[PDB]
Amino acid sequence: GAMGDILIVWAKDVDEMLKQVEILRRLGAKQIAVESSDWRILQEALKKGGDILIVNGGGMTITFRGDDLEALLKAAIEMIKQALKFGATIELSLDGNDLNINITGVPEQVRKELAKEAERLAKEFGITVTRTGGGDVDEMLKQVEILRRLGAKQIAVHSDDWRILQEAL
Amino acid sequence: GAMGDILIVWAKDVDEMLKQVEILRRLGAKQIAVESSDWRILQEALKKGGDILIVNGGGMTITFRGDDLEALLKAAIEMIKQALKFGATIELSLDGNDLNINITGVPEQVRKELAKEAERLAKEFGITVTRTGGGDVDEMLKQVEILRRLGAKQIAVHSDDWRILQEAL
Ligand SMILES: [Zn+2]
Ligand SMILES: [Zn+2]
């Protein structure tokens, strides 16, 4: 179309992903790329008729959940300060009572430390935390192979994430 | 390759973009997509032999610059809190003395307000701020047309950014 060829949807929930894809298709969108750390969300994106996916191999999505937004933001801000100091690229979104933080471009030991801090910060600020993706380059290669078998035509990766994984490989 | 088909580089400077592209090509990368709010960076990415670009039409990149990282982070944190409350998706990176904030998925009036707050926060914390992209749907359509004439084959847009622009259009 006039503004571009591909719309990028960052999906954190299968039902929200399918709802967002249908909303864009009704507005006349022809190609929708789905980004997720969750392999099942990407498989569901292929099942819905997509073939462009954005994967997270060496990184992770941290999701803070709670009714007090100011508590979510205090926890998120500490994660942001640390991740940026460690040289990470970060993606942020607020989805209802969920604050989603995608972290790429840090090695395994730093990822492990950030995941530990996420648990600590959640307990401090009286909220819950979920971690999706990260922790195995072999699992990444396997899951990418599975997406291709399920009909993925173009798989995109953050360059910082790819460089971390090549250093590991 | 084994981990995917496309590497995504977020470029904030032409020389840094060309250096990052050459680093990935030496590691055996075959397809590199360049993302920028700066139309000249995307044109330079095409000149270097790329054909996949990620554009920002309705959003903007805010860049805080200064020698005190703690000052950059205080300014960035206020921008993050506001942008998320307004329903924006945010991308963050630290590049030397530059803290880069890509904001999409907010209407023109909210973008205008966030750009004003960026100026105020910069003055408060004794740092400088640069704003790249955003402020004209007609300019976006023109610049996308120019990228295609210059040989862009696939142009990607954040879905939240595309929905804001369709509501404007
Ligand atoms: Zn991403
Ligand atoms: Zn982006």
Chain centroid to Cα A90, Å, comes to 10
| Paired tokens of A122 | 């959640």
Question: Ligand nearest A36 Cα, by number?
Answer: 1
Kindly state the helix (H) or strand (E) to which residue A97 belongs, with its residue range: none
**Cα–Cα distance measured from residue B9 to residue B63, given in angstroms and rounded to the nearest whole number:** 17
**B2: phi then psi, degrees, rounded to nearest 5:** -65, -30
Beta strands in B47-139 (DSSP E): 52-55, 60-65, 89-95, 98-104, 128-132
**Cα–Cα distance measured from residue A35 to residue B54, given in angstroms and rounded to the nearest whole number:** 14
Residues 6+ positions from A99 with CB-CB distance below 8 Å:
A63, A64, A65, A72, A73, A75, A76, A92, A93, B84
CA-nearest of B14, B36, B51 to B155 is B51
CA-nearest of A106, A102, A92 to A41 is A102
Chain centroid to Cα B82, Å, comes to 18
Identify which of B4, B29, B69 has the shortest CB distance to residue A155.
Answer: B4
The reported resolution of this PDB entry, expressed in Å, is 1.9
CB B61 within 8 A of CB B102: yes
Identify which of A27, A154, A159 has the shortest CB distance to residue B9.
Answer: A159
CA torsion B59-B95-A38-A8 (nearest 10°) is 30
Residues 6+ positions from A97 with CB-CB distance below 8 Å:
A65, A66, A67, A72
Identify which of A20, A87, A92 has the shortest CB distance to residue B80.
Answer: A92
Residue A145: closest C-alpha in chain B: B2
Determine the length of chain B.
Answer: 169
**Cα–Cα distance measured from residue B92 to residue B99, given in angstroms and rounded to the nearest whole number:** 7
Judging contacts by C-beta atoms under 8 Å, the chain A residues touching residue B16 are none
CA-nearest of A104, A99, A135 to A35 is A104
CB A39 within 8 A of CB A155: no
Q: B87 and A94: CB-CB below 8 Å?
A: yes
**Cα–Cα distance measured from residue B34 to residue B55, given in angstroms and rounded to the nearest whole number:** 9
Interface of B with A in 103-162 (CB under 8 A): 140-141, 144, 154-159, 162
Identify which of B2, B20, B90 has the shortest CB distance to residue A159.
Answer: B20
Interface of B with A in 2-21 (CB under 8 A): 2-10, 20
CB B89 within 8 A of CB B149: no
Q: B27 and A84: CB-CB below 8 Å?
A: no
Q: A99 and B89: CB-CB below 8 Å?
A: no
Largest CA distance in chain B: 48
**8-state DSSP, A5:** S
How many H-runs (helices) and E-runs (strands) does chain A carry?
6, 8
**Cα–Cα distance measured from residue B159 to residue B55, given in angstroms and rounded to the nearest whole number:** 11
Report how far ligand 1's centroid is from the alpha carbon of A56 (Å). 8
CA-nearest of A58, A150, A94, A57 to B85 is A94
**Cα–Cα distance measured from residue A134 to residue B104, given in angstroms and rounded to the nearest whole number:** 26
**Cα–Cα distance measured from residue B134 to residue A1, given in angstroms and rounded to the nearest whole number:** 19
**Cα–Cα distance measured from residue B75 to residue B29, given in angstroms and rounded to the nearest whole number:** 36
Alpha carbon of A36 to those of A57, A103, B107: distances in Å?
A: 10, 12, 25
**Cα–Cα distance measured from residue A45 to residue A56, given in angstroms and rounded to the nearest whole number:** 15
Chain centroid to Cα B138, Å, comes to 18
Method of determination used here: X-ray
Residue B80 near chain A (CB below 8 Å): yes
- DSSP, collapsed to helix, strand or coil, labels residue A10 as strand
CA-nearest of B84, B111, B98 to B167 is B111
Q: Which domains does chain A have, with CATH numbers?
A: 7-56+136-168 (3.20.20.70), 60-132 (3.30.70.600)
**Cα–Cα distance measured from residue A12 to residue A9, given in angstroms and rounded to the nearest whole number:** 10
Residue B89 near chain A (CB below 8 Å): yes
Angle at A7 between CA B98 and CA B89, to 5 degrees: 40
